[PDB]
Design a protein around this ligand. Structure first.
Ligand SMILES: CC(=O)N[C@@H](Cc1ccc2ccccc2c1)C(=O)O
Ligand SMILES: CC(=O)N[C@@H](Cc1ccc2ccccc2c1)C(=O)O
Ligand SMILES: CC(=O)N[C@@H](Cc1ccc2ccccc2c1)C(=O)O
Ligand SMILES: CC(=O)N[C@@H](Cc1ccc2ccccc2c1)C(=O)O
Ligand SMILES: [Mg+2]
Ligand SMILES: [Mg+2]
Ligand SMILES: [Mg+2]
Ligand SMILES: [Mg+2]
Lengths: 368, 367, 367, 368
């Protein structure tokens, strides 16, 4: 398989309601999509960067620059490629994992389509649907939060995740537990907003039976997470820190993590995400599938990946309409709290050309 | 894919020379092969059990019994199957890893043939040929050993592995190093023949620069290997102990192993073998591909597996004629110390019917 | 101090000889310079990124983009600024340390110029000159290497650092020691080129008495470095892994590092570099000053930083003419193996406008 | 800069109310001040020793003797000096940290004044005011204590620290919590008055939610503090034991301390105090600013130092009138629970000559 070129698109999609995390509020999702072109067929990739470097150091214009000037040219110059060979072909470039993972995703989709093989089959799926949670942002008031949570519960979502930050942690958790009870699956996510000095405040979450607290400290503070685990009862989950399978093995050995959130872009693609799942399984560490507000393309791949055997807690892969009035693929629709795993070749979905054109703000071709 | 049935064949293949390990001498290889039949087509699996339970608890008649009475009927009762689903469909049956791995291998070959996809592509190959070592048995005398070793080096094998046991360790090593020099890649394999009380004898291997000593102690003695590693300079490699990816992670965490031999049948199949490779890579532990004297069917799958990126030491996947005058597939032929990775769909090879019929001693259809 | 604006300039400076590391060969240095303008006066900053992301994830076009669209506008929106406040004003932007450090450097130079205070005084200098080593690249042949090394020793450099990679480690070291003897201060730098599986090869460096081996493994592999240190005799030094004072403390606690290379841009600026120095001193870990082939602006700041008390091994801050026929400031000239610490306000040097204009390929004003 | 001489003064300042710790009651503060004289200008330093060696081995007459006969002469003999060079110039003399820190403070103030640079700027301030607690002594009765605490709370102090000792620990803490509630920030300080054998008594503080227990055991017993931490719930803070940045790193590695009190004189001066702050920050250990009942000179420097970023708990730098009816500088006045960081050159304050003369009991010049 030779890669002939890539068409890179910038896409903008308004959210049905603004989404607030500890790093800010977003009301529109801006993203990059990649259409890889080979003599045997096309494939689609999606990048999970945001507009600015608020979640990690990567962001849309940076990922676009590196794809255009380093990563795509390296794959174009290669005589033969496969998705597994993308990693060594790009190894000389440091970091840029989300960008590399998007490009890998496109290459894999093209390769798999040519063999009439689904992402699910390639990744090792063992079931045909997955249970889905939802991630709920920070609100201006507690009554708004309780209405939003009760709405999701009425749609049949099986687990609630709350964004937290200093000033919005113990009270929202208490209120949710009072309104909805002790049997709801509940967890929280700080997106790096605390320090080890906040351990007393985080220990105040102890009586609420949370499944986990996701990424309370900064990305690089692995040892600090292991020290926090010794002071709080809520199990520690890591997101931003888990940049690779080796990083997962490290964090596990250090006592820094009991449960791991797997996001394929964050680790440099779907193939490394599978290795993360396998390393965690081999150490008895449960995983769940993370979500970066992807279009149906990324959502489809994520639903496939979430059907592997060590994904034993509900993921953040919500239905398309949690975020988007109109998706660019056929939409993912919740059914009895589950999403169905896609079945055709590759991702199992592709953009509806008319809907994609409507949300495309620019595109560029990168050829030889 | 619905599994229609499986044919189980018993095959006997004489070796070009008898092969002696610490558990005995074998002059013929007796093995079981599986042909899985689906409405798409067929796939071939090979079991790595021997005649008796001398290497591990599994052996040919046992594997055949469990396949016929438990494992194959479980897959036949399933609505849909895929190679990845073989593991949960069989998880209620404890152990029997070599038997399960053979069945998974047949399923995976059928599945991959239907998608026109090679084992190499499915497993994540990054290169199109692999460097091959050879495993040399215990001999009656040191001069014989030196003739056999020189012969393999003249064929271009890139590394020499010597089988060892009490009474045949330090002297054969010393002689090989004196004859052939310090630059030859050299390692030893005890197949569980020592105890922790033999540590002083194994420490006598220290001045010879061996790459590793493979499985000096028994399969279950993971802690003992970690204590041995504190007393000897030669790095520890595990084979028999590594029964799964979890067992690899455990052994690594305990300090019991620095290098891991991966045998797909021993771990329950090619899919778990990949997971073993990935768990070792994540901990910085090099792997290399083991060999159970397979026909070209298993050899083909193994060459594919050995082309993954963390396989950074030469494997035991020798050319077909190290073992067999006539293989049942197109033979693997060493070239510049390497074997080429197969390219067609599935395994990339299949039995030549006339040659297979010639070495087949029994067969049965399980539908 | 209110920041009025920043000029960003792109500069290209040919090297007097090509410089080869494990990540490739560079014959020209392309860099970004910043001129921060305040109502008091001006200050100069220099970014240590290269053209592409081969040493770390940051590179010139990337750093320029993030400075223009995020970092400089954040400082322009602030009411009052000081160099110490640059860090919290930019903390919401993840990573981008070399870019932030360049901007901090310009701010700090403007601020210190206004108080008539040198970098050396602000950072806590305890001496007025520093002993300098040199970093020597990989060569095509061993005789070339020996000519280049003898040349630097004849200039009076007090220590030799060799770039190494697989295929160029033990032999060049052995040759340097044979030619120049056991009393020369000698160390090696892999720039991440090895894995833990190469430990036996790196252990072959043991008999040569190296001061250290710098960053043998990848940037994120802190645990792997601690495991390597248990297998080899040469002390481990980290460069790429040391991205902050916290990262230094972590690496030290884990047993991953015995000696630390401090590069101000790599850690996010001169103020964090001081904190790295102080954290290492509190744990008994020696530091030395790294070099990114800076112009006289960065070289000046680095010589100042290298005069702090825990810098007890010779740095890589070579004289200007190790790299450049004509520097853009008054050049640094070795004297008795030392460079003098600058004495005026700020950096103590500034660009000679004619020489700067000559190597400037682009510039833009961000107001 | 050459140091030409130092004028050393003994000063006596009556306290507005006697102050009782585990080592005794003091009703007057006796202290040493230093006026360093250089051709470019003067600088002020203040020593934190007391009259007798009850808090540490250093005391006023001893610090005066060592300054006059060893430390000042060593700096006078030096060709050129800077505050950073004070440490190596004095390294040959063992110990005497408070004395050395006073001399360093004067030299630094003189150097910074000459560059028109504040202590805040030199030390790395990131904010222009700091939240202040108060330290409250041992009283003869519980009702007196409760009146004193309620008075400070009415002045707007943000945190209460109680001196404790055998016979005055659990009861005063219980009474404070009963009167003032669970939300007041509360901590205790033993000044070395307990042994490891008192662990059961100290564990009886567990239900009161104290932020910390400061220096329960003797200065040299670092390992003992780590063992006590395994038996009590109240986090351990160290004061007397933290004599340097290396001592802080040691105590942290041994598990002996979760929170560190920084006193610049105790560690040998403001420059080492900054290194203490940075070492603790790098290990995720919060710090707060200690107080030795300084005049406005030491108070000004301490308020500057307390504005650095890892000072995340309220310090003991109370307003001047917590101790003194009339300070020797313009006084520090609490405003909304905070003190403002000084802004001019050096310390930002200097003695009012008339007020200083009134409280000066003796002075001596040490010249070449
Ligand atoms: C479902 C969830 O909480 N996702 C991310 C955060 C995230 C949040 C908001 C975003 C807005 C625009 C673009 C990317 C975003 C990523 C997380 O787990 O941390
Ligand atoms: C190449 C190598 O040394 N193989 C195995 C052992 C092995 C040895 C001999 C056998 C003889 C007949 C059947 C199966 C056998 C398996 C090992 O690595 O331990
Ligand atoms: C003096 C030394 O070895 N420097 C760096 C690497 C480095 C090397 C080469 C470069 C070439 C062009 C631009 C930046 C460069 C940075 C190091 O210590 O790892
Ligand atoms: C505010 C506080 O509690 N300070 C010191 C103790 C202290 C107490 C009383 C003193 C009386 C005269 C001179 C020096 C003194 C120092 C401490 O933290 O341990
Ligand atoms: Mg998250
Ligand atoms: Mg073996
Ligand atoms: Mg380096
Ligand atoms: Mg105290």
């Amino acid at each position: 398989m030779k890669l002939s070129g890539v068409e890179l698109r910038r896409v903008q999609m308004p959210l049905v309601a603004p989404f607030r995390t500890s790093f800010g509020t977003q009301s529109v999702r801006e993203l990059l999509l990649l259409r890889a072109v080979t003599p045997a067929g096309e494939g689609w990739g999606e990048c999970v960067t945001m507009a600015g470097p608020l979640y990690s150091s990567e962001y849309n214009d940076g990922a676009e620059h590196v794809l255009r000037h380093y990563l795509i040219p390296a794959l174009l110059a290669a005589e033969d490629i496969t998705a597994a060979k993308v990693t060594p072909l790009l190894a000389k470039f440091k970091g840029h994992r989300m960008a590399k993972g998007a490009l890998e995703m496109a290459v894999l989709d093209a390769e798999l389509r040519a063999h009439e093989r689904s992402f699910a089959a390639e990744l090792g799926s063992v079931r045909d649907s997955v249970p889905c949670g939802v991630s709920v942002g920070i609100m201006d008031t507690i009554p708004q939060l309780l209405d939003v949570v009760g709405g999701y519960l009425d749609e049949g979502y099986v687990r609630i995740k709350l964004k937290i930050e200093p000033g919005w942690d113990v009270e929202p958790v208490r209120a949710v537990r009072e309104r909805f009870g002790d049997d709801v699956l509940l967890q929280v996510d700080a997106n790096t907003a605390y320090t080890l000095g906040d351990a007393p405040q985080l220990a105040r979450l102890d009586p609420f039976g949370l499944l986990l607290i996701e990424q309370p400290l900064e990305e690089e503070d692995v040892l600090g997470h292991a020290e926090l685990a010794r002071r709080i009862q809520t199990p520690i989950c890591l997101d931003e820190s888990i940049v690779s399978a080796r990083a997962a093995a490290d964090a596990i050995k250090l006592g820094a993590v009991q449960i791991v959130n797997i996001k394929p872009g964050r680790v440099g693609g779907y193939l490394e995400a599978r290795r993360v799942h396998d390393v965690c399984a081999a150490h008895g560490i449960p995983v769940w599938c993370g979500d970066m507000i992807e279009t149906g393309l990324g959502r489809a791949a994520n639903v496939a990946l979430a059907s592997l055997p060590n994904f034993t807690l509900p993921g953040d892969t919500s239905a398309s309409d949690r975020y988007y009035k109109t998706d660019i693929t056929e939409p993912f629709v919740l059914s009895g709290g589950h999403l169905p795993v896609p079945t055709g070749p590759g991702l199992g979905v592709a953009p509806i050309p008319e809907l994609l054109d409507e949300v495309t703000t620019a595109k560029v071709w990168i050829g030889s």
